[PDB]
Amino acid sequence: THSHGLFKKLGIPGPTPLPFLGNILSYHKGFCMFDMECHKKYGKVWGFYDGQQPVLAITDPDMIKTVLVKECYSVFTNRRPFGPVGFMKSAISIAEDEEWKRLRSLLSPTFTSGKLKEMVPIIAQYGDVLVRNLRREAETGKPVTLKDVFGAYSMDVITSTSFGVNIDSLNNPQDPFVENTKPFFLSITVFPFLIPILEVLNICVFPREVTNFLRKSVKRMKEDFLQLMIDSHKALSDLELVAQSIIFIFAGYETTSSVLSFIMYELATHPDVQQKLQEEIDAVLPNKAPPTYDTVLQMEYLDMVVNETLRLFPIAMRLERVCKKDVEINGMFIPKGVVVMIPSYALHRDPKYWTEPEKFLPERFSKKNKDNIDPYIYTPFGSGPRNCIGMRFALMNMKLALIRVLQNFSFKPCKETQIPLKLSLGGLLQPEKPVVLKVESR
Amino acid sequence: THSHGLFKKLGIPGPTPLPFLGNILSYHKGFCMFDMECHKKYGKVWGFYDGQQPVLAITDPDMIKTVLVKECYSVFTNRRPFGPVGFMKSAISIAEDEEWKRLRSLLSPTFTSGKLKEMVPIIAQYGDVLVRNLRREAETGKPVTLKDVFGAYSMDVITSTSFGVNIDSLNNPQDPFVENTKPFFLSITVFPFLIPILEVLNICVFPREVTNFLRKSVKRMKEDFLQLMIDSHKALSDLELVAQSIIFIFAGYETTSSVLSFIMYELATHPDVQQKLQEEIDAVLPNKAPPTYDTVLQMEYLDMVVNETLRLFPIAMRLERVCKKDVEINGMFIPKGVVVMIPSYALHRDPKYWTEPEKFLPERFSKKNKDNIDPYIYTPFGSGPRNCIGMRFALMNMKLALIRVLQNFSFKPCKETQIPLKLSLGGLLQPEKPVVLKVESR
Ligand code: HEM
Ligand code: HEM
Ligand SMILES: CC(C)(C)OC(=O)N[C@H](CS[C@H](Cc1ccccc1)C(=O)NCCc1ccncc1)Cc1ccccc1
Ligand SMILES: CC(C)(C)OC(=O)N[C@H](CS[C@H](Cc1ccccc1)C(=O)NCCc1ccncc1)Cc1ccccc1
């Protein structure tokens, strides 16, 4: 408990922690409800304990910019430790300090405007596979699971954008890594001292059978992101090369299909926005013209729909940085070892910044009203040197999928559609019941 | 084993490590013999594994200066992690990086030339208690255990030099902390991942009964080193104050009596040096004059005796620094996490630097021959910003004890004297059998 007197000493308010457990019993309603409740109880700053780990939550936009941007390289360089990872310690999202800096610098030129412009005529293929597979499940009066057909699409994109492997994600044969994307973490906070125990037993969060399903696949491409790695600080090792491919597969698959599912739920439960977005798509792309890089960046209402959905459902929920040494940001002492946390979900739904924050209103992001939005309150991709490096790629992939789908189909709520949607009362930001909707062909 | 291929990759030679154990089975002859053997087998540089921890030994004087002095603050700032320590993490010899820098800067003015000059007329008291207690055990024909009566003296000095507590160390009553100075570490190298487990069970290397024998004693002196702490970077906390007192007690007690025991063994087994040193003491201090600060610094042969003994018996044996990031010192790549080690015992007995290194010859340190001695080969107190901060104090205390003792007594080997002396085939640099000698009154 000796560390549970930290916030009491610093005069920082917060819920009283129980011995050993801290405040983790409050996660029984999920991180999000616990964050919004503390935001209401304690105000701009509060602390709690993930077991013995003190966590200081900050909501001041200036203080948030200081942590994420101004003092990132010096004090707030790394995220909360995560284990056991095995060789995934060399992953960019996990790597720390100097190893992270080397990985970030040599992986940043992967998501430039030029590299993304090269991937657009390639992603267009699986948009048609997405429509034709949707055409089958839609031509029959059978409600459709979005994250299934969206997940099949998201799989198709990430294998080719970074490597070159092309598969219709209903081939169902030799190289689906569904084994890769296939509660013990509750003990990570109670037993973070057991991370060193498990890191010597080869225990990873995914088994060694999967992380060799692709480890060999990388070597056969001695014969895109895979290319750019062997093309390029000390050069990329062959195993580091492997670890970043894994990070991109998780990111490009789980985030894409999940956000697209939240988007289509919003359009179905708001028929006006769906019709308005369908009008804009028909105007920029008449005769169902194929979307391109520049035409995707021309659709303003499409971007307003995407941003507003990301406000309601920020899949990260929280942004975190480890305070690597004593600091005093914006007039507040922060001792070493404290985990600094930014409650993105809570700030995205704060009534003090958003009128009717529970309502889905894309007009918040109109160029008339977008200016009234603080970039350090709305942070769906983070901020600063450790923001989402695949942000521009993620937006481009999702919009290309929406354009081609809304060009051919309309979406209505079915009898089994969960309205209003329940968020997963568990850890990662997902819905409780999967999203199902009726699909009609235009 | 995955880390056991490190030195094989780097082309660095060394003994082949067994799985899990590494090369720790070779410590069965002690660190010293293993170091000297590797020095002979592999030359200037070699590596081995304390379990899964790679340890690179360097013997090049330039490379040693680079580690200890030139690149100390930047790369080689901390020692090998030590556990479990409890609150002793705040101890200066244990503390790391910025916390160490703050502790070093605010504790350095304790061992100045001026502060040491103030402690000399106080240490002179227990030199007489040392003689009178020696006078009893010497007036009777009963061989004497040095580390007993030296340990009683060393205890007397450290309590007063830093606090003000005066005790005849044969009072045997209320405040002897023999409980403080009262094989499980073999598992520290095989289970360094268990250090985080034990650090939450309040398990220290000394029990909580002892580390509260003095924790309360510090507070009663709200009512010397204890004074200088409350007098003084953020100021010294009250518990940090406590932790450095503990470090000084261990250092000032165990090192002092052990070195003095090795010294008196050398003088007894070399009657010429003992007579020559007794002559010099009688010349600087005629009529058995009391030794002072300046008169102690005038005796050259006394310093030659002390330095040569420290060459044969460097109680640290090894100097270590943790490589905190990839470096290339003197043209050799050193990857992050590697523990850099300097085998002081091996270098002090290297025939390539010392003619007849096993022989006790104080004339190596005559001002005629001292110049031929490399300060990065002979490092009894370390070097650089993390050298022994109590070096000047340790030399002064031991010399004041030797002067007063050699002024009144001569020392002859007894029937039970271990000749030649056997070093403890175990961990810390001690003799196997305790040192006993005959004592005659002058
Ligand atoms: C809707 C889609 C996505 C969202 C909302 C999202 C959001 C985020 C957020 C909030 C962070 C943490 C930022 C911070 O801590 O300041 C992050 C990190 C990251 N994201 Fe994304 N992400 C998405 C998709 C992707 C994709 C497709 C990739 C493909 C490579 C990707 C790669 C990464 C990486 C590598 C990091 C860690 C960067 C670093 O630590 O240097 N993300 N993302
Ligand atoms: C014959 C007596 C002594 C010898 C040979 C000795 C030797 C050493 C050595 C070799 C080191 C490590 C240096 C390095 O790693 O570069 C050290 C560190 C240290 N010694 Fe001594 N020591 C002696 C007595 C003392 C005494 C009496 C004190 C009293 C305070 C003391 C306090 C310290 C401290 C605090 C450190 C750690 C310094 C730091 O890490 O900043 N030592 N000693
Ligand atoms: C400390 C705390 C738990 C609070 O948070 C995290 O560490 N949780 C994730 C967990 S690892 C995951 C992939 C993985 C999994 C096992 C081993 C190696 C690698 C990843 O790499 N990304 C997750 C999705 C995602 C990516 C990119 N963009 C957006 C979303 C890591 C993470 C990293 C950045 C932001 C949020 C979460
Ligand atoms: C990593 C490795 C084991 C190879 O080495 C070390 O850590 N072993 C010692 C161990 S802790 C000891 C006191 C203590 C003990 C338990 C908890 C807290 C504190 C200390 O503080 N000093 C030991 C004597 C001494 C001091 C001062 N001067 C000369 C000799 C630490 C140490 C530090 C510097 C140099 C050598 C050894």
Mutation for B interface: A49, A75, A200, A323, most B CBs within 10 A? A200
Looking at CA atoms only, how far is residue B316 from chain A in angstroms?
A: 29
Backbone angles phi, psi at A376, to 5 degrees: -100, 0
Q: Tell me the helix, strand and coil percentages in chain B, rounded to 5.
A: 50, 10, 40
Nearest residue in chain A measured CA to CA from B193: A196
Instruction: Tell me which residue in B97, B193, B326 faces A196 most closely, judged by beta carbons.
Output: B193
A196 to chain B: which residues are within 8 Å by CB? 192-196
Instruction: Output the DSSP codes for B86-129.
Output: GGGGGSTTT--HHHHHHHHHHHGGGGSHHHHHHHHHHHHHHHHH
Backbone angles phi, psi at B146, to 5 degrees: -65, -55
DSSP 8-state class, residue B353:
T
Query: Please, what's the b/e burial string for A230-246 (b: 16 or more CB within 10 A of its CB; e: otherwise)?
Result: eeeeeebeeebbbbbbb
DSSP H or E stretch at residue B243: helix B238-250
Query: Please, what's the b/e burial string for B90-105 (b: 16 or more CB within 10 A of its CB; e: otherwise)?
Result: bbbbbbeeebbebbee
Q: In whole angstroms, what is the distance from residue B67 CA to residue A411 CA?
A: 68
**Positive or negative CA dihedral for B289, B291, B293, B294?**
positive
B52 to chain A: which residues are within 8 Å by CB? 200
- The answer, yes or no, to whether any atom of ligand 4 lies below 6 A from the CB of B55, is no
C-alpha B283 to ligand 2 mean position (Å): 32
Rg (CA), chain B: 22
Residue nearest to atom 5 of ligand 4 (CA): B80
At residue A39, what is the residue type?
Answer: H
Contact residues for B340 (Cβ-Cβ < 8 A; gap 6+)? B55, B56, B58, B67, B76, B320, B321, B322, B323, B334
Q: Best substitution site from A82, A96, A181, A215 to test ligand 3's pocket, by max atoms within 8 Å of Cβ?
A: A82
Q: Which tokens belong to A63?
A: 């203080």
Contact residues for A145 (Cβ-Cβ < 8 A; gap 6+)? A434, A435, A436
Is A279:A410 a contact under the CB 8 Å cutoff?
no
The answer to whether the CB atoms of B98 and A326 lie below 8 A apart is yes
At residue A82, what is the residue type?
Answer: F
Is B45:B64 a contact under the CB 8 Å cutoff?
no
* HEC secondary structure over chain A: CHHHHHHHHCCCCCCCCECCCECHHHHHHHHHHHHHHHHHHHCCEEEEEECCEEEEEECCHHHHHHHHHHCCCCCCCECCCCCCCHHHHHCCCCCCHHHHHHHHHHHHHHHCHHHHHHHHHHHHHHHHHHHHHHHHHHHCCCCEEHHHHHHHHHHHHHHHHHCCCCCCCCCCCCCCCCCCCCCCCHHHHHCHHHHHHHCCCCCCCCCCCHHHCCHHHHHHHHCCHHHHHHHCCCCCCHHHHHHHHHHHHHHHHHHHHHHHHHHHHHHHHCHHHHHHHHHHHHHHCHHHCCCCHHHHCCCHHHHHHHHHHHHHCCCCCEEEEECCCCEEECCEEECCCCEEEEEHHHHHCCCCCCCCCCCCCHHHHCCCCHHHCCCCCCCCCCCHHHCCCCHHHHHHHHHHHHHHHHCCEEEEECCCCCCCCCECCCCCCCECCCCEEEEEEC
- Tell me if the bond preceding A84 is cis, omega within 30° of 0: yes
Q: Count other Cβ atoms within 10 Å, centred on residue A436.
A: 21
Ligand positioned closest to the Cα atom of A253: 1
Q: Which tokens belong to A14?
A: 């917060």
A4 to chain B: which residues are within 8 Å by CB? none
Q: Count other Cβ atoms within 10 Å, centred on residue B357.
A: 16
Backbone angles phi, psi at B210, to 5 degrees: -75, -50
Is A204:A84 a contact under the CB 8 Å cutoff?
yes
Residue nearest to atom 18 of ligand 1 (CA): A388
Distance of alpha carbon B185 from the chain centroid:
19
End-to-end C-alpha distance for chain B, whole angstroms:
63
Backbone angles phi, psi at A214, to 5 degrees: -110, -25
Q: Give the bridge partners for B46, in sequence order.
A: B57
**Positive or negative CA dihedral for B69, B75, B78, B81?**
negative
Q: In whole angstroms, what is the distance from residue A150 CA to residue A254 CA?
A: 10
At residue B190, what is the residue type?
Answer: V
Q: Give the bridge partners for A333, in sequence order.
A: A328
Query: Please, what's the b/e burial string for B24-60 (b: 16 or more CB within 10 A of its CB; e: otherwise)?
Result: bebbeebbbbbbbebbeebeebbbbbbbbbbbbbbbb
Q: Count other Cβ atoms within 10 Å, centred on residue A123.
A: 22
Looking at CA atoms only, how far is residue A330 from chain B in angstroms?
A: 19
Contact residues for B324 (Cβ-Cβ < 8 A; gap 6+)? B75, B76, B77, B78, B336
Q: Which residues of B touch A (CB under 8 A)?
A: 52, 97-98, 192-197, 199-200, 325-326
Ligand positioned closest to the Cα atom of B399: 2
Q: Which residues of A touch B (CB under 8 A)?
A: 52, 97-98, 192-197, 199-200, 325-326
Q: Which of A112, A68, A75 is nearest to A385 (CA)?
A: A68
- The answer, yes or no, to whether any atom of ligand 1 lies below 6 A from the CB of A69, is no
Question: Does the annotation place B323 within a ligand binding site?
Answer: no
Q: Give the bridge partners for A175, in sequence order.
A: none
C-alpha A357 to ligand 1 mean position (Å): 24
Instruction: Tell me which residue in B97, B199, B325 faces A98 most closely, judged by beta carbons.
Output: B325
Nearest residue in chain B measured CA to CA from A51: B200
Q: In whole angstroms, what is the distance from residue A412 CA to residue A426 CA?
A: 27
- Report helix, strand or coil for B286: helix
Alpha-carbon distances, residue A262 vs A379, A381, A398, B271, B323 (angstroms): 18, 17, 12, 92, 48
Q: In whole angstroms, what is the distance from residue A5 CA to residue A332 CA?
A: 17
The answer to whether the CB atoms of B193 and A192 lie below 8 A apart is no
Q: At what angle do helices A271-284 and A300-312 cross, to 10 degrees?
A: 140
Contact residues for B349 (Cβ-Cβ < 8 A; gap 6+)? B36, B312, B357, B358
Alpha-carbon distances, residue B423 vs B29, B44, B152, B262, B434 (angstroms): 11, 25, 22, 10, 10
Q: Best substitution site from A388, A389, A428 to test ligand 1's pocket, by max atoms within 8 Å of Cβ?
A: A388
Q: In whole angstroms, what is the distance from residue A319 CA to residue B309 CA?
A: 59
* Sole residue written with tokens 């790597």: A95
Q: Is B253 left (phi over 0), alpha (psi -120 to 50) or beta?
A: alpha
Backbone angles phi, psi at A412, to 5 degrees: -120, 150
A195 to chain B: which residues are within 8 Å by CB? 196
* Sole residue written with tokens 């009250």: B238
Q: Which tokens belong to A61?
A: 């936009």
Looking at CA atoms only, how far is residue A22 from chain B in angstroms?
A: 14
Is B417:B437 a contact under the CB 8 Å cutoff?
yes
Distance of alpha carbon A404 from the chain centroid:
23
Side-chain half-sphere of B245: how many Cα atoms within 13 Å? 31
Distance of alpha carbon B191 from the chain centroid:
26
Contact residues for A17 (Cβ-Cβ < 8 A; gap 6+)? A1, A4, A23, A48, A49
Q: Going along B115-202, which residue ranges are E strands? A: 144-145
Alpha-carbon distances, residue B182 vs A392, B84, B250 (angstroms): 64, 17, 10
Distance of alpha carbon B104 from the chain centroid:
18
- Report helix, strand or coil for B327: strand
Is B431:B418 a contact under the CB 8 Å cutoff?
yes
Ligand positioned closest to the Cα atom of B244: 2
Is A195:A85 a contact under the CB 8 Å cutoff?
no
Alpha-carbon distances, residue A257 vs A152, A162, A297 (angstroms): 8, 18, 21
- The answer, yes or no, to whether any atom of ligand 2 lies below 6 A from the CB of B309, is no
Alpha-carbon distances, residue A308 vs A259, A301, A304, A359 (angstroms): 11, 10, 6, 10
Is B163:B224 a contact under the CB 8 Å cutoff?
yes
Nearest residue in chain A measured CA to CA from B99: A325
Q: In whole angstroms, what is the distance from residue B338 CA to residue B322 CA?
A: 6
Contacts of residues B334-339 at CB distance under 8 Å and 24 or more positions apart, as own/partner, are B334/B56, B335/B6, B335/B10, B337/B54, B338/B6, B338/B54, B338/B55, B338/B56, B339/B50, B339/B53, B339/B54, B339/B55, B339/B56, B339/B80
Ligand positioned closest to the Cα atom of B116: 2
B97 to chain A: which residues are within 8 Å by CB? 325
DSSP 8-state class, residue B194:
G
Q: Which tokens belong to B161?
A: 């030099």
Q: In whole angstroms, what is the distance from residue B14 CA to residue B17 CA?
A: 9
| Residues in chain A preceding a C-to-N separation beyond 2.5 angstroms (breaks) | 182, 223, 232
B409-413 and B339-343 beta bridge pairing: unpaired
Q: Which of A422, A162, A403 is nearest to A295 (CA)?
A: A403
Contact residues for B152 (Cβ-Cβ < 8 A; gap 6+)? B130, B133, B169, B170
Residue nearest to atom 29 of ligand 4 (CA): B251
- The answer, yes or no, to whether any atom of ligand 2 lies below 6 A from the CB of B381, is yes
Residue nearest to atom 26 of ligand 4 (CA): B251
Query: Please, what's the b/e burial string for A182-220 (b: 16 or more CB within 10 A of its CB; e: otherwise)?
Result: eeeeeebbebbbbbbbbbeeeebebeeebbebbbebbee
Q: Which tokens belong to B96?
A: 């790391």
Q: Which tokens belong to B236?
A: 């010294």
C-alpha B93 to ligand 4 mean position (Å): 7
**Positive or negative CA dihedral for A213, A215, A218, A222?**
negative
